[PDB]
Amino acid sequence: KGAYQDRDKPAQIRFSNISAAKAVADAIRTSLGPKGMDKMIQDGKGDVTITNDGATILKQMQVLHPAARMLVELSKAQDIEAGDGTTSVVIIAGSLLDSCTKLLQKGIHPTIISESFQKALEKGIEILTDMSRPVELSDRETLLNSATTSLNSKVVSQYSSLLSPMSVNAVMKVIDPATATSVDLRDIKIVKKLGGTIDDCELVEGLVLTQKVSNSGITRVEKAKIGLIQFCLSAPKTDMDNQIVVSDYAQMDRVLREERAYILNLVKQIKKTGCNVLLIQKSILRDALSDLALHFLNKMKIMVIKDIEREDIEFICKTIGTKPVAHIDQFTADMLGSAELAEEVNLNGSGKLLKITGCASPGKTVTIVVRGSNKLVIEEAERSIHDALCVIRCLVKKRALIAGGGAPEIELALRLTEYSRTLSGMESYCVRAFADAMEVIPSTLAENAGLNPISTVTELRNRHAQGEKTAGINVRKGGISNILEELVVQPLLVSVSALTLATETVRSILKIDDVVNTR
């Protein structure tokens, strides 16, 4: 007879948290893998969203249980660190907790479960690293295969032939492949424009803008010199309160004339540089482009795009080599950007786009125009392309590759079962639970593919025991096979981060024993 444990509310709270987490995992289990399908989510306001992304799904369904909220945060963290695996991580967490259920019932302490899970996690990171193979960023075929694998799960998979080379080109265009240790995907701009179909998506090396051109008649410019204008082309206005007191009839005409002359001098100093395209920043508190200024620019044959946003300035400069000018005195030729063409293109009556293509200083920036027949499919195409970019980012960060099709999970299950048999004690039960929990991804992949999950997962375990550690679920043949022949590869970072973050979240949830309702 040990300690009576006079209180049962800690156990009730643990079981409620485990149940909520397992419920979330089982709710999103259907959106896992190439044969997985999407969920539609209608917000309270009525905003519809179709998606296969685990992070998006979890953020959009307003889960209420604390454990479910924590799983949402977990998926968001995985989306940050790897951008791919946001469903696998939640499923792994739910499964580990579902195993904590039977462990707790067996009568193991949550602290022992947590420590044994940390042990199993370290051993599993070891195992996955052993499985991994190095990759060279020059291996364009390996990059294409990683991107295609990442896209196989999404609605944009019939267009993979189009969107994988774009998703690899963008990243290889926005990084120096020899020195890069990461990539900032804010350098990759995505522009969603309704109309056409997803096969109409494009990778624009130059610049794309949704702002409209103010000139009528000047839509196309070749050999374009472009200038950014952070000052206002309108009547003078001091930063102090200013008035112009008229006391004689002559002063009225004089005021109008001097205003005209000010504006004309401005636009003439602009023309004198050879500038034929003029990007004007957006200006509240003062008119950035008066009618006189527009008249004069048009007469001088200059295309004008105003209302540029103060956040697109760094992007536009990074793209087309311009330097932002805030005083007309400093507006010279060295502050311009040279572009072989700048045109306002129409998209089959579905809107207009300003495309600045060709650049003498195309500095590590690219744009992707996402087309589509519906807002929903456009949004999910954007999300999938982002997932592919993040997969390439993982590959850049950690130059290591792991097989797919549930091969890493199966190898993990197997080797951690062995580790458990070697770690005799009460840690053995917990490590075996960790292994059988990691066995849920292959089961889910099989179920979604339409196979018999038990037989499929047993065949996988058997072949991995024989030694085919690169063996997985071939949804094309309908059974098990060497998955590298199907070219299903993913960065080691995805699996490693998924395992690490899921284990940390599980230990956190296991360290909880009560719930209070504040206020």
Binding site: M37, D38, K39, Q42, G44, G46, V155, I198, S373
Partner: protein, 41 residues
């Protein structure tokens, strides 16, 4: 009836775009296997 001799013509773009858009719509709707309708606030 021979509609080319009867004069019943449609621009190719009509049928082509109709097919492409209809297929895209069918694909997007068919990809949905779940629905979560949140209670408004």
């Amino acid at each position: 009836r021979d509609n080319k001799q009867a004069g019943v013509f449609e621009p190719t773009i009509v049928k082509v775009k109709s097919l492409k858009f209809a297929t895209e719509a069918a694909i997007t709707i068919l990809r949905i296997d779940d629905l979560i309708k949140l209670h408004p606030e």
